[PDB]
Amino acid sequence: VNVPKTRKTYCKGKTCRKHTQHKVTQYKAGKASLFAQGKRRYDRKQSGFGGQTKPVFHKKAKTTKKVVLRLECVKCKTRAQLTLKRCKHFELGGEKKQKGQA
Amino acid sequence: GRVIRNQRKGAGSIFTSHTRLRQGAAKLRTLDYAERHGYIRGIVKQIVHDSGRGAPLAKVVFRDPYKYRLREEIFIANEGVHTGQFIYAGKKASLNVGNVLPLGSVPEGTIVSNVEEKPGDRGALARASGNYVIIIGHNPDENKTRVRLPSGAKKVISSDARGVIGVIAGGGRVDKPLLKAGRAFHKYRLKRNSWPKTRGVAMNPVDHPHGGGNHQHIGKASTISRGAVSGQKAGLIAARRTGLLRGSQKTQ
Amino acid sequence: AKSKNHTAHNQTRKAHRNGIKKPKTYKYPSLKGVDPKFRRNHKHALHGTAKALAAAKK
RNA sequence: AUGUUU
RNA sequence: CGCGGGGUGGAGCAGCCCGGUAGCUCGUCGGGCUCAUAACCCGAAGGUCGUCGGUUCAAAUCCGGCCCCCGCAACCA
RNA sequence: GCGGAUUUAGCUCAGUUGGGAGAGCGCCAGACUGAAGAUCUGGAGGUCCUGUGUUCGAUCCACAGAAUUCGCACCA
RNA sequence: GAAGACAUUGUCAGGUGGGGAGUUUGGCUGGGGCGGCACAUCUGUUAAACGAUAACGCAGAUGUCCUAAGGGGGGCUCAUGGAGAACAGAAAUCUCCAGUAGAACAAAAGGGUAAAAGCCCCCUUGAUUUUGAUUUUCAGUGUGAAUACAAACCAUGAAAGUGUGGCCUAUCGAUCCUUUAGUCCCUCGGAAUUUGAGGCUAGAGGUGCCAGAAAAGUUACCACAGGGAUAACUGGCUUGUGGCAGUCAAGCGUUCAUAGCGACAUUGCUUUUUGAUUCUUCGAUGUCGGCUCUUCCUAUCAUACCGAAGCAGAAUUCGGUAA
RNA sequence: GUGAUUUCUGCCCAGUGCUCUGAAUGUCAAAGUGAAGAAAUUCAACCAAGCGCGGGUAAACGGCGGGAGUAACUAUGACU
RNA sequence: GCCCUGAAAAUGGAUGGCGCUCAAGCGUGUUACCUAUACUCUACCGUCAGGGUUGAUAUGAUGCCCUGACGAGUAGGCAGG
RNA sequence: GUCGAAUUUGGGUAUAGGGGCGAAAGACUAAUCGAACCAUCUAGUAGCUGGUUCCUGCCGAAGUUUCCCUCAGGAUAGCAGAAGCUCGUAUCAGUUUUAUGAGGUAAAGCGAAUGAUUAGAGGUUCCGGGGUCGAAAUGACCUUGACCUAUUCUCAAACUUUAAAUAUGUAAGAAGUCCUUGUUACUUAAUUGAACGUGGACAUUUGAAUGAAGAGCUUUUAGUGGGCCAUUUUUGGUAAGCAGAACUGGCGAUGCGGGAUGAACCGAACGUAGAGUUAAGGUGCCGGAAUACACGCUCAUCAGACACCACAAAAGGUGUUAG
RNA sequence: CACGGACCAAGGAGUCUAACGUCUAUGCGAGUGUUUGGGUGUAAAACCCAUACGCGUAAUGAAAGUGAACGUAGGUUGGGG
Ligand SMILES: [K+]
Ligand SMILES: [K+]
Ligand SMILES: [K+]
Ligand SMILES: [K+]
Ligand SMILES: [K+]
Ligand SMILES: [K+]
Ligand SMILES: [K+]
Ligand SMILES: [K+]
Ligand SMILES: [K+]
Ligand SMILES: [Mg+2]
Ligand SMILES: [Mg+2]
Ligand SMILES: [Mg+2]
Ligand SMILES: [Mg+2]
Ligand SMILES: [Mg+2]
Ligand SMILES: [Mg+2]
Ligand SMILES: [Mg+2]
Ligand SMILES: [Mg+2]
Ligand SMILES: [Mg+2]
Ligand SMILES: [Mg+2]
Ligand SMILES: [Mg+2]
Ligand SMILES: [Mg+2]
Ligand SMILES: [Mg+2]
Ligand SMILES: [Mg+2]
Ligand SMILES: [Mg+2]
Ligand SMILES: [Mg+2]
Ligand SMILES: [Mg+2]
Ligand SMILES: [Mg+2]
Ligand SMILES: [Mg+2]
Ligand SMILES: [Mg+2]
Ligand SMILES: [Mg+2]
Ligand SMILES: [Mg+2]
Ligand SMILES: [Mg+2]
Ligand SMILES: [Mg+2]
Ligand SMILES: [Mg+2]
Ligand SMILES: [Mg+2]
Ligand SMILES: [Mg+2]
Ligand SMILES: [Mg+2]
Ligand SMILES: [Mg+2]
Ligand SMILES: [Mg+2]
Ligand SMILES: [Mg+2]
Ligand SMILES: [Mg+2]
Ligand SMILES: [Mg+2]
Ligand SMILES: [Mg+2]
Ligand SMILES: [Mg+2]
Ligand SMILES: [Mg+2]
Ligand SMILES: [Mg+2]
Ligand SMILES: [Mg+2]
Ligand SMILES: [Mg+2]
Ligand SMILES: [Mg+2]
Ligand SMILES: [Mg+2]
Ligand SMILES: [Mg+2]
Ligand SMILES: [Mg+2]
Ligand SMILES: [Mg+2]
Ligand SMILES: [Mg+2]
Ligand SMILES: [Mg+2]
Ligand SMILES: [Mg+2]
Ligand SMILES: [Mg+2]
Ligand SMILES: [Mg+2]
Ligand SMILES: [Mg+2]
Ligand SMILES: [Mg+2]
Ligand SMILES: [Zn+2]
């Protein structure tokens, strides 16, 4: 799919609360932190003997992920998140379609 | 799933050596003042067969230098040693077959037997029938002797380590075919319970890594890593190479 | 071992043992899905009607 | 350096 | 996911490790030499550097993306 | 009988992105040779495995059938 | 004597480690396995004109694709056929006429659509925000999908209006954990500030066995609980296949359909074939063949007596009563 | 491992093993080092063996092709 | 239409058997007759339901009495013994 | 078989259970070995097999829905019991009628769309054009082909204009109808309307039929979650006492009379008795009941003799009967 | 022609407990529960008892926290009595 940037859409920043321009980027998860309580508990549980103490998923079936657009209001900076339908090729860049051309 | 035969050998229950008929440990004299500074003369009283050993032993009687009595020693007989012969052991003994000399006191090219690895260990190297060590040189500073061992290895030994002039008697022994399971039986009856040997490939998987299969076959490479563990080290342990040896030895 | 997959056999008999029950019509039915604008104004209209009918007892 | 057969 | 490395005429390629400027051999086309081929000689053709974007008086080389390949290492929905 | 596969000038094949059927080994013709083989130059060579179907067309986007094979076909 | 702050030993760390330990190694299924997916789903049909409705029924489809192929508005009309224009012919571009859709609308199929839902053009982001109700599946739970509103902010158009993704029917995902966005709110419990962590609300990372364990084989050395819910024998139903037999009569039989045969068809019988099924037996009906022995059937090889012949004799062939 | 004697043990190190090489070499743990921070901590550099890179080895495990044409009858193909 | 040919299987055997031929067979029609735990009436048992009767000697008001209807049953539930 | 050495054997001694020992069979290790024996953990767990102890009375099932690593199990809903509760001028119903819808099956149709499909006939020579002449053009023909026109034979689960029967939604009143006018922030240009009210009028049939051991309501629990059979509709299969669906009725769970016999068929469902009458089925004898009455048909050297049901076909016969 | 049962006697299988759901009975009732313990006793009984504690009388929110009368504790319809 091809999704454009700059997204004039609704903003909930409590100052705009209205349709404003939003810069569009793709959501990237972000590094899993140590000291998150789940990670701390998992490390404590994995320490010592006993082997693997929690499941490790193997039966992968999805061939795509749901792309998330981070929509950032250009004036108030509040971010919103929009999920798109599953796609295999996602481009944020332009190069719109042309009709009647070669 | 079972402990394999080479693992069971280490417990040493039925795998200990059959030492009843043996004459005693074959050793040089204790390295004492007389051998450190001059020589001591003993006499060969008997050349006798040792059970389980190929080479004959020589019972050599020396006088005790500190107490009026005789000290019998069990040497490995070198070829040409005879009963009634005077054996001389020490720094100042002559270069004659059967004499015990420090490695430093013998010229390059000398053939010695029952060579000490360390001075005073009373004999470690070239003890089997027909085997010998060759002095290939000396390093007087940092006093040492370079020697050629029966296996072809070059070793540097202290120049104070002793050896017996000549070659261990009983040589050529392995040139005669045993010709008979019975003769192999009687050979190992006086050495240890290591014969006969069932092939691991003729066993079941529980008994041996090579066991099992609808045909007798190893199934995986018989060359086993040096870092393998007990129960895995069956076959060609840490083999650098396999197959028929073609070409020359003595790599550089 | 394969087995039966589905049948509606005996289902109508089971349902008619305790009978198909009409759903107990009520006056003043619920206003659940009714247009919230209409409902918002209906609340005010009813409060005003209640106040008027109360005051009308003089 | 290569160059067959009649 | 991390850390590295590589992608250049048809092919292998040097070129990059701080722009002065895309080359080497084979293969392909022509001629010469030979009695004729091979080697050889003289020519001629073949790329603008895997694809984008950026720095820079002027970037294959710098800088970051994307694709492909490889090596090691990592693995709680 | 199931799961795969590949069918294209005489032989081996490249194919084909909704073009247009091509390259070798053959064959023919012409060169070179006293001549033959070798070698060079060319030229033809298929109604694209078959019928019907989507189609502007489409062996090639596409449907089923065939041919040649492989692999499997077990516990009794 | 050798050796030396190195070995060694202790702790932690990385590698190696079926030598050994523990465990696992789907389900449906005309037995199981192999195959397939009928496991989560969508179209048409089966389906018997409300709804619902099965099979490893039938013909197919889904894990995508699209910043337009979403939204609004305007203008136009499609497939095809005929008639015409230099190159230009069957296919190029131009023109008229007919044209109920015989086109197109991403994909499967079905429905729907003509001043449109199709084609072209213009502007856009309603594919947005909040949290409820509702319909299908349904337990009237969840998930997915969809419907109609409300409260905002927008888009488009002159406007009425229309728009909360794709004309409709499929195109997808819990807890825990991680992560992001938001609220800048709540908590860190002796009292504060700042980091850090933990909460609240909404998403994302995924379970396709699709209400969602983390999982390789082999056993002809085998074990246990069971199963006739289920295979390998007989028996029973069936008779496709096998075997046997009719009816018709185009032909063969030099002539001549039927002495003897007999195509194209068609009606049966049998259960000495093999299938199909899984009803009996898995707390056990001894599982090939032969040997031995008895009896039964007749669809008769011989023997008895006969009818027919392409029966001269002889031999043979067809057939009847006959076991 | 093979299995008296006799005769002989062909080719293959691509794969899986085993083995030899080693600061020129990518990756690579704890400790240690540097930076930033108020610190927890984060980041970076360095980082042993192993693996990778290079070699050897089959009396290690093992493995060891297909199609077409072609000879004064056919047939078969020495041959390509 | 009926009958016959078509019409062959294995222990000896089956319109149920015997046997039946203007049938005791086939088609059809009319009556009479036989008999189920069914129907009708009555009695008795129980269950359920609706009632009467604390006005006394009257002790069974969970009692006494009146009326009608009903009664199959695995798994299972409950009740009275 | 072997019998003078890898010989046989006594005693002593060593090796102990994931251990030993094995000239190797998973052999042997005290009748125990693909992991000994003893005791304990331990009454190990079992969705699996077996059993589960008195009587009578009343009521009385399910093998279906959804979900599950589920398919021999459970949860869930349903079916069942029990306890009742609120009322009973009363409520409703596996039914009809009237009124009003909805459907796309049966049938039907194809000189109606789509798709199949048989044939001849008119045109189109621009028919596809060939042949043949035509010096040649299609120019004449001949002709095959196609198209077009009007006809013709036959068809469709996934075709259709039409379109049943059965089944199915709703309504048939007092929570109704009519008249007046109060509230509102909704709605309208507007007391316009919408919704909810106030006040007023209308009880014999309060607005079809029939019935109503009453109606409504609640809680809580059992068992069940293998089903099978019959008619009819119907799918796969040659078919099956096969496999799978729909509606109903049954069997399971059920005796009784009948079908000799038999889970399901016919009849009829059951407290203990008596009398009468019957059902289905029967009435020669077995055997209760007419060797009844009446009209015909049939003679079988395999007669026939009551549905389910325990079989027979095509084709034939101056047998006989009637047309 | 599925399994157990040759026979007989005796034994022989839904128990108790912790915590609970519904229903019912009883006591008291915005309260209720004496029995941890104390007093007492004819001594494991019966009798008596303080302070607490449990549940209830308040909910809601993750939490900080806040916390139930417009009114005759409301209007309408039905409602036994
Ligand atoms: K652990
Ligand atoms: K051996
Ligand atoms: K093996
Ligand atoms: K291991
Ligand atoms: K296993
Ligand atoms: K048959
Ligand atoms: K069995
Ligand atoms: K190799
Ligand atoms: K190798
Ligand atoms: Mg650890
Ligand atoms: Mg050996
Ligand atoms: Mg063996
Ligand atoms: Mg092993
Ligand atoms: Mg191994
Ligand atoms: Mg074997
Ligand atoms: Mg079932
Ligand atoms: Mg010549
Ligand atoms: Mg293991
Ligand atoms: Mg299975
Ligand atoms: Mg329907
Ligand atoms: Mg329009
Ligand atoms: Mg769905
Ligand atoms: Mg709107
Ligand atoms: Mg829509
Ligand atoms: Mg998710
Ligand atoms: Mg969290
Ligand atoms: Mg604290
Ligand atoms: Mg599921
Ligand atoms: Mg069975
Ligand atoms: Mg047949
Ligand atoms: Mg069955
Ligand atoms: Mg038996
Ligand atoms: Mg028997
Ligand atoms: Mg016969
Ligand atoms: Mg041999
Ligand atoms: Mg580190
Ligand atoms: Mg290293
Ligand atoms: Mg007959
Ligand atoms: Mg009779
Ligand atoms: Mg009669
Ligand atoms: Mg009676
Ligand atoms: Mg009463
Ligand atoms: Mg009863
Ligand atoms: Mg074995
Ligand atoms: Mg027990
Ligand atoms: Mg009953
Ligand atoms: Mg699951
Ligand atoms: Mg069972
Ligand atoms: Mg239909
Ligand atoms: Mg029809
Ligand atoms: Mg069950
Ligand atoms: Mg049952
Ligand atoms: Mg019955
Ligand atoms: Mg019968
Ligand atoms: Mg009688
Ligand atoms: Mg007939
Ligand atoms: Mg039987
Ligand atoms: Mg049993
Ligand atoms: Mg028994
Ligand atoms: Mg008893
Ligand atoms: Zn903003």
UniProtKB/Swiss-Prot annotation, chain A:
<dbReference type="InterPro" id="IPR011332">
    <property type="entry name" value="Ribosomal_zn-bd"/>
</dbReference>
<dbReference type="GO" id="GO:0046898">
    <property type="term" value="P:response to cycloheximide"/>
</dbReference>
<dbReference type="GO" id="GO:0003735">
    <property type="term" value="F:structural constituent of ribosome"/>
</dbReference>
<keyword id="KW-0046">Antibiotic resistance</keyword>
<keyword id="KW-0687">Ribonucleoprotein</keyword>
<dbReference type="GO" id="GO:0002181">
    <property type="term" value="P:cytoplasmic translation"/>
</dbReference>
<keyword id="KW-0488">Methylation</keyword>
<comment type="function">
    <text>Component of the ribosome, a large ribonucleoprotein complex responsible for the synthesis of proteins in the cell. The small ribosomal subunit (SSU) binds messenger RNAs (mRNAs) and translates the encoded message by selecting cognate aminoacyl-transfer RNA (tRNA) molecules. The large subunit (LSU) contains the ribosomal catalytic site termed the peptidyl transferase center (PTC), which catalyzes the formation of peptide bonds, thereby polymerizing the amino acids delivered by tRNAs into a polypeptide chain.</text>
</comment>
<keyword id="KW-0689">Ribosomal protein</keyword>
<dbReference type="Pfam" id="PF00935">
    <property type="entry name" value="Ribosomal_L44"/>
</dbReference>
<feature type="modified residue" description="N6-methyllysine; by RKM4">
    <location>
        <position position="54"/>
    </location>
</feature>
<dbReference type="GO" id="GO:0005829">
    <property type="term" value="C:cytosol"/>
</dbReference>
<comment type="similarity">
    <text>Belongs to the eukaryotic ribosomal protein eL42 family.</text>
</comment>
<keyword id="KW-0196">Cycloheximide resistance</keyword>
<dbReference type="InterPro" id="IPR000552">
    <property type="entry name" value="Ribosomal_eL44"/>
</dbReference>
Curated annotation (Swiss-Prot), chain B:
<dbReference type="InterPro" id="IPR008991">
    <property type="entry name" value="Translation_prot_SH3-like_sf"/>
</dbReference>
<comment type="function">
    <text>Component of the ribosome, a large ribonucleoprotein complex responsible for the synthesis of proteins in the cell. The small ribosomal subunit (SSU) binds messenger RNAs (mRNAs) and translates the encoded message by selecting cognate aminoacyl-transfer RNA (tRNA) molecules. The large subunit (LSU) contains the ribosomal catalytic site termed the peptidyl transferase center (PTC), which catalyzes the formation of peptide bonds, thereby polymerizing the amino acids delivered by tRNAs into a polypeptide chain.</text>
</comment>
<dbReference type="InterPro" id="IPR014722">
    <property type="entry name" value="Rib_uL2_dom2"/>
</dbReference>
<dbReference type="InterPro" id="IPR022669">
    <property type="entry name" value="Ribosomal_uL2_C"/>
</dbReference>
<dbReference type="Pfam" id="PF00181">
    <property type="entry name" value="Ribosomal_L2"/>
</dbReference>
<dbReference type="InterPro" id="IPR022671">
    <property type="entry name" value="Ribosomal_uL2_CS"/>
</dbReference>
<feature type="modified residue" description="Phosphoserine">
    <location>
        <position position="159"/>
    </location>
</feature>
<dbReference type="GO" id="GO:0003723">
    <property type="term" value="F:RNA binding"/>
</dbReference>
<feature type="modified residue" description="Phosphoserine">
    <location>
        <position position="94"/>
    </location>
</feature>
<keyword id="KW-0699">rRNA-binding</keyword>
<feature type="cross-link" description="Glycyl lysine isopeptide (Lys-Gly) (interchain with G-Cter in ubiquitin)">
    <location>
        <position position="92"/>
    </location>
</feature>
<keyword id="KW-0687">Ribonucleoprotein</keyword>
<comment type="subunit">
    <text>Component of the large ribosomal subunit (LSU). Mature yeast ribosomes consist of a small (40S) and a large (60S) subunit. The 40S small subunit contains 1 molecule of ribosomal RNA (18S rRNA) and 33 different proteins (encoded by 57 genes). The large 60S subunit contains 3 rRNA molecules (25S, 5.8S and 5S rRNA) and 46 different proteins (encoded by 81 genes).</text>
</comment>
<feature type="cross-link" description="Glycyl lysine isopeptide (Lys-Gly) (interchain with G-Cter in ubiquitin)">
    <location>
        <position position="118"/>
    </location>
</feature>
<dbReference type="GO" id="GO:0003735">
    <property type="term" value="F:structural constituent of ribosome"/>
</dbReference>
Swiss-Prot record, chain C:
<keyword id="KW-0687">Ribonucleoprotein</keyword>
<keyword id="KW-0689">Ribosomal protein</keyword>
<feature type="region of interest" description="Disordered">
    <location>
        <begin position="1"/>
        <end position="36"/>
    </location>
</feature>
<dbReference type="Pfam" id="PF01779">
    <property type="entry name" value="Ribosomal_L29e"/>
</dbReference>
<dbReference type="GO" id="GO:0002181">
    <property type="term" value="P:cytoplasmic translation"/>
</dbReference>
<comment type="similarity">
    <text>Belongs to the eukaryotic ribosomal protein eL29 family.</text>
</comment>
<keyword id="KW-0963">Cytoplasm</keyword>
<comment type="function">
    <text>Component of the ribosome, a large ribonucleoprotein complex responsible for the synthesis of proteins in the cell. The small ribosomal subunit (SSU) binds messenger RNAs (mRNAs) and translates the encoded message by selecting cognate aminoacyl-transfer RNA (tRNA) molecules. The large subunit (LSU) contains the ribosomal catalytic site termed the peptidyl transferase center (PTC), which catalyzes the formation of peptide bonds, thereby polymerizing the amino acids delivered by tRNAs into a polypeptide chain.</text>
</comment>
<dbReference type="GO" id="GO:0005829">
    <property type="term" value="C:cytosol"/>
</dbReference>
<dbReference type="GO" id="GO:0022625">
    <property type="term" value="C:cytosolic large ribosomal subunit"/>
</dbReference>
<comment type="subunit">
    <text>Component of the large ribosomal subunit (LSU). Mature yeast ribosomes consist of a small (40S) and a large (60S) subunit. The 40S small subunit contains 1 molecule of ribosomal RNA (18S rRNA) and 33 different proteins (encoded by 57 genes). The large 60S subunit contains 3 rRNA molecules (25S, 5.8S and 5S rRNA) and 46 different proteins (encoded by 81 genes).</text>
</comment>
<protein>
    <recommendedName>
        <fullName>Large ribosomal subunit protein eL29</fullName>
    </recommendedName>
</protein>
<dbReference type="GO" id="GO:0003735">
    <property type="term" value="F:structural constituent of ribosome"/>
</dbReference>
<feature type="cross-link" description="Glycyl lysine isopeptide (Lys-Gly) (interchain with G-Cter in ubiquitin)">
    <location>
        <position position="51"/>
    </location>
</feature>
<keyword id="KW-0832">Ubl conjugation</keyword>
